[PDB]
With several copies, the nearest count.
Chain A
């Protein structure tokens, strides 16, 4: 845990405009690799310089996505810290928060004009709660009976 804190100490923090720019780079890289595959199979002629610079576009978008996740790792730790003592230890909650971060960063739009953390908090909390429901007990209980147990 302390090693993970030192590992997430390396990251930085961004703002909403930079998040929108990162999403633009991500979608441009995804279009770039879709076009790369599209001209790979049954293609006519892949341009060398255009293929090189759109490969660099794809790599730039991938590294942008990586640094975005690294930036939001501290946020998801601070979000996941409010679930101690409920079945699992902290690490399972951390990794479920990482899964929720992946799902939210897939399901995010750059024309929202919304803060990424405020967007993703519902997804993170949803993933953590449903995984707590799945891995709460020795015998698995369906979520509706879990709900009425909570009630």
Chain B
């Protein structure tokens, strides 16, 4: 539930930023942390930490 909640938060924040209209540094950093969250959900501990 913690991992699912984390992915929900990142996805909602990215949807809010993409309807808002933001610079690419913010948007792509949000995309990167979303991708890392999905990887941490599917197999926690494979890549990175």
Interface residues of A (CB under 8 A from B): 4, 7-8, 66, 69-70, 73, 91-92, 94-95, 98-99, 102, 135, 138
Q: How many of chain B's residues have a CB under 8 angstroms from any CB in A?
A: 15
Interface residues of B (CB under 8 A from A): 1-2, 5, 9, 13, 16-17, 20, 22-23, 25-26, 29-30, 33
**Consensus secondary structure, chain A interface:** helix
Once A4-B29, A138-B1, A138-B2 are accepted as A-B contacts, the answer to whether A95 and B13 lie under 8 Å apart by CB is yes
Once A73-B25, A135-B9 are accepted as A-B contacts, the answer to whether A95 and B20 lie under 8 Å apart by CB is no
Please tell me which one of the listed residues A69, A99, A135 contacts residue B23 in the complex, with CB atoms under 8 A apart: A69
Nearest-CB distance from A75 to chain B (Å)?
A: 14
Asked whether A138 lies within 8 Å of B5 as measured between CB atoms, the reply is: yes
B26's nearest neighbour on chain A, judged by CB, is: A98
Once A91-B33, A138-B2 are accepted as A-B contacts, the answer to whether A7 and B13 lie under 8 Å apart by CB is no
